Protein backbone atom coordinates (compact mmCIF):
# COMPACT_ATOMS: atom_id res chain seq x y z
CA UNK A 1 0.00 0.00 0.00
CA UNK A 2 2.90 2.35 0.78
CA UNK A 3 5.70 1.72 -1.73
CA UNK A 4 7.60 3.57 -4.44
CA UNK A 5 5.20 5.03 -7.02
CA UNK A 6 2.53 6.44 -4.69
CA UNK A 7 4.45 8.32 -1.99
CA UNK A 8 4.27 11.99 -3.03
CA UNK A 9 3.37 14.30 -5.91
CA UNK A 10 6.53 16.03 -7.16
CA UNK A 11 6.64 18.40 -10.14
CA UNK A 12 9.52 20.08 -12.00
CA UNK A 13 12.40 18.65 -9.95
CA UNK A 14 15.66 17.56 -11.61
CA UNK A 15 18.22 15.38 -9.83
CA UNK A 16 21.80 14.79 -11.00
CA UNK A 17 23.96 11.92 -9.74
CA UNK A 18 27.13 10.08 -10.76
CA UNK A 19 28.42 6.54 -10.42
CA UNK A 20 30.29 5.63 -7.21
CA UNK A 21 33.02 4.17 -9.45
CA UNK A 22 33.32 7.61 -11.09
CA UNK A 23 33.86 9.65 -7.91
CA UNK A 24 36.07 9.42 -4.83
CA UNK A 25 34.78 7.92 -1.59
CA UNK A 26 36.66 10.54 0.48
CA UNK A 27 36.56 13.80 -1.51
CA UNK A 28 38.62 16.26 0.60
CA UNK A 29 37.86 14.36 3.79
CA UNK A 30 39.86 16.32 6.37
CA UNK A 31 39.88 19.81 4.80
CA UNK A 32 36.07 19.98 4.71
CA UNK A 33 35.33 17.52 7.50
CA UNK A 34 37.07 19.64 10.14
CA UNK A 35 35.17 22.94 9.50
CA UNK A 36 31.84 21.10 9.18
CA UNK A 37 32.39 19.31 12.51
CA UNK A 38 33.44 22.64 14.06
CA UNK A 39 30.29 24.32 12.71
CA UNK A 40 28.03 21.56 14.06
CA UNK A 41 29.67 21.55 17.48
CA UNK A 42 29.51 25.35 17.74
CA UNK A 43 25.82 25.27 16.83
CA UNK A 44 25.08 22.64 19.51
CA UNK A 45 27.65 23.05 22.32
CA UNK A 46 25.74 25.71 24.29
CA UNK A 47 22.59 23.60 24.31
CA UNK A 48 24.40 20.36 25.19
CA UNK A 49 27.41 21.02 27.48
CA UNK A 50 26.33 23.19 30.55
CA UNK A 51 23.97 20.52 31.99
CA UNK A 52 26.83 18.02 31.99
CA UNK A 53 29.15 20.68 33.42
CA UNK A 54 26.85 21.18 36.39
CA UNK A 55 26.51 17.37 36.70
CA UNK A 56 30.31 17.29 37.09
CA UNK A 57 30.16 20.05 39.73
CA UNK A 58 27.33 18.32 41.64
CA UNK A 59 29.17 14.97 41.48
CA UNK A 60 32.42 16.45 42.83
CA UNK A 61 30.59 18.43 45.54
CA UNK A 62 28.62 15.37 46.65
CA UNK A 63 31.71 13.16 46.80
CA UNK A 64 33.69 15.74 48.79
CA UNK A 65 30.71 16.39 51.08
CA UNK A 66 30.46 12.66 51.81
CA UNK A 67 34.23 12.57 52.47
CA UNK A 68 34.05 15.39 55.01
CA UNK A 69 30.89 13.77 56.40
CA UNK A 70 33.05 10.75 57.25
CA UNK A 71 35.67 13.14 58.70
CA UNK A 72 35.99 13.31 62.47
CA UNK A 73 34.63 16.50 64.02
CA UNK A 74 37.37 18.05 66.21
CA UNK A 75 34.77 19.89 68.31
CA UNK A 76 33.96 16.59 70.02
CA UNK A 77 36.34 15.39 72.80
CA UNK A 78 37.21 19.00 73.65
CA UNK A 79 35.30 19.56 76.90
CA UNK A 80 37.09 16.84 78.88
Amino acid sequence: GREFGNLARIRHVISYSLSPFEQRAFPSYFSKGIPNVLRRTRERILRVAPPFVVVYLIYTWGNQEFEQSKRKNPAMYEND
Binding site: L7, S17, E22
Partner: protein
Protein backbone atom coordinates in the same frame (compact mmCIF):
# COMPACT_ATOMS: atom_id res chain seq x y z
CA UNK B 1 21.28 -12.32 -37.94
CA UNK B 2 18.17 -12.79 -40.11
CA UNK B 3 16.55 -9.71 -38.54
CA UNK B 4 19.71 -7.67 -39.20
CA UNK B 5 19.87 -8.84 -42.83
CA UNK B 6 16.22 -7.87 -43.35
CA UNK B 7 16.80 -4.53 -41.59
CA UNK B 8 19.80 -3.57 -43.74
CA UNK B 9 18.33 -4.57 -47.11
CA UNK B 10 14.85 -3.18 -46.35
CA UNK B 11 16.40 0.08 -45.14
CA UNK B 12 18.41 0.36 -48.37
CA UNK B 13 15.28 0.85 -50.48
CA UNK B 14 14.47 3.96 -52.48
CA UNK B 15 16.77 6.72 -53.67
CA UNK B 16 16.64 8.82 -50.48
CA UNK B 17 17.92 6.17 -47.99
CA UNK B 18 20.55 4.99 -50.49
CA UNK B 19 21.81 8.58 -50.88
CA UNK B 20 21.67 8.94 -47.09
CA UNK B 21 23.76 5.78 -46.65
CA UNK B 22 26.27 6.97 -49.27
CA UNK B 23 26.68 10.32 -47.50
CA UNK B 24 27.10 8.77 -44.05
CA UNK B 25 29.44 6.07 -45.37
CA UNK B 26 31.74 8.58 -47.05
CA UNK B 27 31.69 10.84 -43.98
CA UNK B 28 32.24 8.13 -41.34
CA UNK B 29 34.03 5.13 -42.87
CA UNK B 30 35.59 7.08 -45.73
CA UNK B 31 34.15 4.52 -48.16
CA UNK B 32 30.83 2.92 -49.05
CA UNK B 33 30.68 -0.54 -47.48
CA UNK B 34 28.83 -2.85 -49.90
CA UNK B 35 26.05 -5.17 -48.80
CA UNK B 36 28.17 -8.26 -49.53
CA UNK B 37 30.74 -7.14 -46.95
CA UNK B 38 27.88 -6.54 -44.49
CA UNK B 39 26.59 -10.06 -45.19
CA UNK B 40 30.08 -11.50 -44.63
CA UNK B 41 30.42 -9.63 -41.32
CA UNK B 42 26.95 -10.85 -40.33
CA UNK B 43 27.62 -14.51 -41.18
CA UNK B 44 30.92 -14.54 -39.32
CA UNK B 45 29.01 -13.69 -36.11
CA UNK B 46 28.29 -16.71 -33.90
CA UNK B 47 27.01 -17.11 -30.35
CA UNK B 48 30.42 -17.27 -28.64
CA UNK B 49 31.73 -13.99 -30.03
CA UNK B 50 28.32 -12.39 -29.42
CA UNK B 51 28.41 -13.20 -25.72
CA UNK B 52 32.10 -12.20 -25.63
CA UNK B 53 31.40 -8.77 -27.17
CA UNK B 54 28.28 -8.34 -25.01
CA UNK B 55 30.33 -9.13 -21.89
CA UNK B 56 32.89 -6.60 -23.15
CA UNK B 57 30.29 -3.84 -23.52
CA UNK B 58 27.41 -4.63 -21.12
CA UNK B 59 28.69 -6.70 -18.20
CA UNK B 60 29.75 -4.75 -15.07
CA UNK B 61 29.56 -1.39 -16.86
CA UNK B 62 28.34 1.88 -15.39
CA UNK B 63 25.25 3.01 -17.35
CA UNK B 64 23.79 6.43 -18.08
CA UNK B 65 20.15 6.72 -16.99
CA UNK B 66 17.69 9.40 -18.11
CA UNK B 67 14.13 9.42 -16.80
CA UNK B 68 11.24 11.80 -17.40
CA UNK B 69 7.75 11.56 -15.94
CA UNK B 70 6.43 9.77 -12.84
CA UNK B 71 9.78 8.15 -12.14
CA UNK B 72 9.74 7.71 -8.36
CA UNK B 73 9.66 3.90 -8.61
CA UNK B 74 12.51 4.08 -11.14
CA UNK B 75 15.39 2.58 -9.11
CA UNK B 76 18.39 4.67 -8.20
CA UNK B 77 21.92 4.10 -9.38
CA UNK B 78 23.00 1.35 -6.96
CA UNK B 79 20.12 -0.95 -7.92
CA UNK B 80 20.68 -0.44 -11.66
CA UNK B 81 24.45 -0.85 -11.24
CA UNK B 82 23.87 -4.06 -9.26
CA UNK B 83 21.51 -5.22 -11.99
CA UNK B 84 24.35 -4.71 -14.46
CA UNK B 85 25.88 -8.00 -13.22
CA UNK B 86 24.83 -11.37 -11.80
CA UNK B 87 26.13 -13.05 -8.64
CA UNK B 88 25.83 -16.43 -10.41
CA UNK B 89 27.64 -15.01 -13.48
Amino acid sequence: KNILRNALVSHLDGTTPVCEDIGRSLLTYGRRIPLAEWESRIQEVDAQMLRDICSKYFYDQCPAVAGYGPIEQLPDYNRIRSGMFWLRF
